[model samples]
Target: LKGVGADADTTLTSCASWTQLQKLYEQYGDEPIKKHFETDSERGQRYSVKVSLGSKDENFLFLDYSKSHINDEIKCALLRLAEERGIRQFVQSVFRGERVNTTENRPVLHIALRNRSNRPIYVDGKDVMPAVNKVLDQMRSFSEKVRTGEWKGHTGKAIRHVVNIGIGGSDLGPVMATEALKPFSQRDLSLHFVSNVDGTHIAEVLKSIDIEATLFIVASKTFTTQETITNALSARRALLDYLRSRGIDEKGSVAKHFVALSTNNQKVKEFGIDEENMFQFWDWVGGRYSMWSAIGLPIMISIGYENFVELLTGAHVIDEHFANAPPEQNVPLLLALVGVWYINFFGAVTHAILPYDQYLWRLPAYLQQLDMESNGKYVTRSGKTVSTLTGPIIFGEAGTNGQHAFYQLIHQGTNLIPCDFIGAIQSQNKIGDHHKIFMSNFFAQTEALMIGKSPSEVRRELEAAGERSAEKINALLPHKTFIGGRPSNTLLIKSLTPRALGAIIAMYEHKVLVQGAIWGIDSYDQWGVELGKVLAKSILPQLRPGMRVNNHDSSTNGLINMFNELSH
Candidate 1:
């Protein structure tokens, strides 16, 4: 596990490609990107790559990184770096169900959830496809019942609202995916996601929905996540009290309106969710990657099972492509390598994900958890501290709005932030030239960042404006001039369909995996999030009426004491 398929005697910085990359950086580091374009006419065509949807020739994802400061030699060096790092073998090992998540001693097999081909995938000498298909079949039937009004509540009312209660991966993926693919969702059923421990989150959602026509899906892998269970209990009490107020106390009501997505059968039974209604996912599926599993019950119920399957199909397409595509043509690898070039070489501390489409507003947040939680590690798989950065701070908002807000800094800021601009060629909803105007900004922002306004260009503009005062003209030159050579990647999809959303997400997931491999770390494990959870668990007991916490640090005790004082 220490080597993870790389040669045992050689480390990452000691590789021949690493040395060559260092030298190439010294040669091409300060070269303007426009110069790269001027020197080579084919730079645009040569730097971009596309991943095709096998069923349709026109439906594909096009990734253009030509604006980056990289030429054929640099691109080759990056590919060689990936090869020497054993990224290909690491990918194969994950797809074959090896225990690549060495920290947890579990195999990383989220790909098997969307393995539409039904091919045999083994784990521990046993094929897991049968279990995978079994859970999928369960999800299909259950979602169909809810969608068709066949699964009625105790009052004989069909479920009209679905409230998914979970935190972190369980909540984020489903929330983001359902919001992203809202155009395909069933309008009759209202969807709500509650992940916060604050009572207001579940209270506000429950206020809008009728207890008689609402279903609650409790999504905790261990049936033990504090926030999830806390919210689930609140919802359960609300349902029971609502019925009790109406003189209708029934045991089966809980079964009719609640389901569990968990593996702990005993805990599910104790919570009153029938064993038959529990949908189980394996240990191999991390929370961030569990949406394709039974954790997507809310997605299936809200968007219909067929559309959900199409989403899974879209992920399968990217999965197959990731496992089979070559280094140069690979979409995920190309994205990952460019990220490595910036993070390790350029010393970039942050990455921006700017999606032009409004439907993808949650994408940046989703990728934040996906990328940061996976690769934000200081120690390598071999238990050595990393020599270079592991992950960059990811943040962004939907475009036009972001253009008004952060584009000012990105265009002229001191930091050279790498951006990924995502947009669909066509809109799902159109009104006159609205999309055209939106896309114009989408296309113009990247060009503006690449070839910014120069001092001479600003002076020429000031002279053209009939400014006679040389003092004012000289003063405004520095303010208006923009030093160019910023880098960005543009991802264009045919449309924002269910398939396209799935592909985009899976592509990012693979990119995170590749970056983790290159950095010699375990991408699947998230020990970084545990310390806060443990601290909060201990502090929770101190918030009671008479418990005065003084055993910990002074600040911690003071905060807890103040909280208790205020509550009392």
Candidate 2:
């Protein structure tokens, strides 16, 4: 079977003592992911190991893999494979702005967004640092005007409310970051994010805000994102109508109330935004990673300009570490290797990112785009079809909320789900000691997942509770028995400060970068998202009252016909 494969030289197998890990896993406990764990204390003490990658500006990047089922022997194999796959070389290539994203002929250098060293990153023989810095300066300057009350609305009023409008990366990154670092934001200003095309979303926001004291940041690189533009036009109507009711001229109102984050200065002017109001980013800055660029106007306005800089600086710290640290110690590289082990070797189909902090509820949603949009590909750089599974299905929510919801499945479901547990040792608020209870659950969940309750333990508990009936004990035991040995990664940060949040997000970005390199796919380019938009545009006009549906399946036709019947 091994000798009779399609491609001879490219296909090979049997490199290590994989059988030992296989037997360990098969004969292992079912409680956690394998069985030998007993007490929570024993599991926590024996399994977890943390590696410090970097701590700059008082923000730290730590990687813990104790709860994960993979051991050093399995890790050693994956690391060797990473070297053979030239992962480190590819990291250097990304930094140097080589065409790592071979599909688009673009360099994958999102690091340029946070290049604190002012390094020269090249594409097509041109250095892009100056332009990057120029945009950043524009962002800082514009943010200062608003923060200092120098930027005024149509009625010559200082801005008090900012609504950021965009979709995908334009919306997710800024919204997640701003919410995560809400503690650092200006107290007097109000920030809102509206990305959905639904009328109610924009309607509810407009009804609540003061018309003359609001600023709208329209964030779309092309200024033509369907949902974004629709929302922008709605906001424009709301603003212009308010001005007309007060008998003010509509001529200069748009430029006063709206600025854009886009590369299309012509479109910004067309939308009545002055060219100076359009903050630009380059094609190399993929939408998902553009938050560190001028795409972060909302974040800058929310947390102020300096904290935005701190976010970028925190990312740069990890960039330096990823470039310099060895494969054994590099946090991103190790995480990527563990991912490869689970997806490629252990048949893990999904990865969960469970952040214990409630502020990070949107984090899973953000990372879904970041990882799935990037690595969710089958074709390699050479356009050859991948012979193995690529990215895992990534889904998560914050816990102990998730502990009540999906942890049930992770604890007792038929499949193994690899997860990362994120939490800070200190709470963002000091109102009471609630963080202690939360953190206690955080510690206990990982321990409980990895070292679940055994059948005998459940039996003894029932017996101790005075349930003497054998039938009752047997029935309860089946439900209560947990097969220990489930795997997890616990990232215990020092605090949830802006700097730490920055480092954590950057850690994930780099991890995705490294994983793409390992998987032999272009993580920078996401052509998969276009087919839906193309289909949506083609289908839009036909949804009118009398228009006919065509070129679609009967299922789609029936649904539209049903909608027409229901509406008319």
Candidate 3:
């Protein structure tokens, strides 16, 4: 709100560029993607944007939008749309810590967490960089102790298993990053994540690790998240029980095995964790964006401190790119505009993020929460009802697996969903021709998605296969024929290194920010996810064995009563 305009006129549909884009869409809406390639032989090179800060291969990333349903005219209009909406100023305001999250009256400065350049980012007239660096130093020291067997449990056993107890942002970021950067991780360390409130989630993790050699990181900001604390309490009990069984019930043993990533010093201390072990993050850090904060303790422990620094540096590259890069070459801006083009103009309601690398299988899930929770708003920052579509339904799976499962709908279904095809030029683990074959499918899928098989092509192929029967050819034509105009963007990185993964995640984060800016919505606040949380709190007390004479809707009352009866 500090950077964006205060007037209701800032809405998406009110922009003059919006109207111009509507006209451009009508003029070129019917043209096929292949037609654009045919007309402009250099379209791929023209539309692609590559970023590399240093000569290192890990710093390189390429984005190809030639296959998307966009051209120079539409691209110019979209860039104009970003300008008319004051996106440049908005992005600057966020980096400068101007309390852009007006709903909560907090500055959105997750970028400061990874400010590897050490630039001063102010909040309430104080530079947050010192505090950010302090936390990073703390994480580095703590992670090194655990990784090098310097930190021992009460039984004098070095920790080898780490169980992170958290939910939502705290859980998702560490889980995704640790998996994505596993190749760089300490091979002896075994990492486990327990996020669900369900007992089975923590139970399974507890069963697998030695209590003496296992460390628990409780990652709730307040140290009171329902699921995280529940799992943490359960894990603490298991730790104490295991120690008690060994005839040594040390009251201070919890301090040796448990650490916390929370701001609540008193609560963390009350939970039997040493106050020194409680890492702190600011309120400006949204849950989904807290990975660069102390929420990444698990990530730091799994991968070494140096690799973690590389991750932060990688994100810093994108931060600088998002802040300074020109509109045409700004990766986040172009991605955001293309998404808006599909969601608002073409009425496409879903966006698929199909990462070809198995290491990045969770990338889509991570982006789902980042994008949807950020932009899934019904009103503007000024509280005016939105006249246009807000966020798209973000969903996807890993490449070949998704191809086998849901790619059918993407290829032949009635709905036209915009897709992002992510892959690396090199694999982390190259087992003979597996990566080559994997990349081959990656190349083919995007091509197949954009240049779908046509009726005439299908006919020619069927005839060439020696199908002489006219009836069989006719029957196969309609089924095999593809419409050939689906939209997609391809992102190719040199390899799935820690730095590359960081850059990729930060790119999508800024993309969401830009899209939210265009829509005049608060990308930081998530009041939408609050209702269910609040309702569940009230309903939690009523889940007794037989005490359910509810004062609510019949369905709610009936379900509560049924759950009460069945749960007991």
Candidate 4:
């Protein structure tokens, strides 16, 4: 079954009455197009969401949130209130060592993993922050050494390529941060990611690099994921082949080239990674949320320790905000509540995360796992099926690109899908009028969504274009008529630095936290991922040379038989 299944009688209620939604449509529906235009003499100053050209421009002072739709206003306000109370209780509980992850009966304390102050953070009568700090410090020192070329590869060459092998959280968080903060990356080091079990992906990446000068970081929490282990084994075999081709000893070469980001010491040692090379994090740090821990080894290796710390410091800023900020003022909390308003109340099926920056292209895919896998649960903390819709379908692509592809559906489709448009004031790669042109689209799309052109407005525009035939114009007017008042959240950052990127990601993370808290589910535990894993193990032996499958479902048996016939 897909996550939560809500019944007809249990549909979520809006904070605003149904009459309120009707009232909003009535008030704004027939409003004249020229009214807003005449109110603000300046085109830029009229909108609640304004686009500023520069940092010091007077345009930045004109963002008017009070002028937005009533539904948005009410939802934002309620979210702000909830964020205040929820964050306060969360911070107090975590600091006091309470088990917030009630389903797992374990303390959810990843915040302690990046606590570099060496202060004691207790969970179950033990101070775990010391160990957390130790690993962070080790990661820092190791990253610095490699970045400065003091640490060399098997052939005594400075490492030029760093490949991280892992799936889900191990891959997503670090990869997202690395790409987001690509401007801060060190010279001569490129980071690559291999998470899929598909041999084609591994084969393609291996062909591009010199194996001797490449460092592989295998990051699985248990060191036993099928995809991760398969990829790691493939990487090892490829490395051995490369070394033998180059006349180097395979035994000594593989050990010097590989390092691990795992807590499984025995597994790490068994995989041929030395004890000293295995960086350890604790059980408190769940895999999907572990990029701040040793899972960020590729990030550190690519960007250097200083920039990586800046990234963590950026996250710390949001952590502080999430911990102390009032609900109304908390950005993450506001985002979460607004999302819930759409999912539960407004009946939105999907939420789109559209970033305008090309470097942030993969962010939607990364957030897909972070949000979907975390809260995509059918049962509550007590294992009772939820009566309300828990999460929305999270999907998106980068803007400008999405404008050509899915923006059609978003603009005029039957379903209501709330969207978040993320952008920055400055672009990392600024050339020609690229940033301004990009920002213009960002402003235009939101404006189009909120204040869509009327039928008469479209008719007049079409007439102006010289297609003045009455029948043609009349027939196309309905297609061109845009239903305004679509809801969207615009997140504008000062810049796209490592720190800013970190803050941006942390904001979303805390947003998910607030939602999970309200829903009363253990967002940290992913029991849903377990069944497929168990099935894969049971099915693996049937793929061997002379194996037979029995005691299986008809579909499973049929599929195995089909595979056997195809292989023979």
Task: Estimate, for each residue in 408-458, the C-alpha lDDT of model 1 and write its tens digit.
Answer: 899889999999999999998988999999999998999999998999999
lDDT of model 3 at residue 407? 88
RMSD for each model, in Å, please?
A: 2.7, 3.6, 2.7, 4.7
Model 3 agreement with the true structure over 1-568: per-residue lDDT tens digits? 3333334434578679999999998999788899989989999998989988443664587889889778889999999999999999999999999988989999998899999888888888898999999989999999999999999999899999999999888988999999999999998999999999989999899888988999999999777888898889899889888878888967789889999998678888888888789999989999989898999999999998898988988888988999999999999899999999999999998999999999888888899889998999877888766777889999999888999999889999999989999998888897999999898989998899899998899999988997999899999899998897898999998888888888998999999999998888899998887889899988988989977856889999999999888886
Best by TM-score: 3
Alpha-carbon lDDT, every model: 0.89, 0.80, 0.89, 0.73
Error of 1 at 139 (Å): 1.1
The lDDT, on a scale of 0 to 1, for candidate 4 is: 0.73
Candidate 2 lDDT (Cα, whole model)? 0.80
TM-score of each: 0.97, 0.92, 0.97, 0.87
Q: Model 4 compared with the native: what TM-score?
A: 0.87
- lDDT string for model 4 (305-368, tens) is 7777767766776766667665545566667766765675556769999988877988998888
TM-score, candidate 2, is: 0.92
Q: Which pairs clash inside model 4? A: 80-327, 80-328, 84-327
What are the clashing pairs of model 3? none
Q: Between candidates 1 and 4, name the one with more favorable TM-score.
A: 1
Worst 10 residues of 1 by lDDT: 1-10
Which residue segments of model 1 deviate by more than 4 Å? 1-10
Question: Which parts of model 2 have CA positions greater than 4 angstroms off?
Answer: 1-58
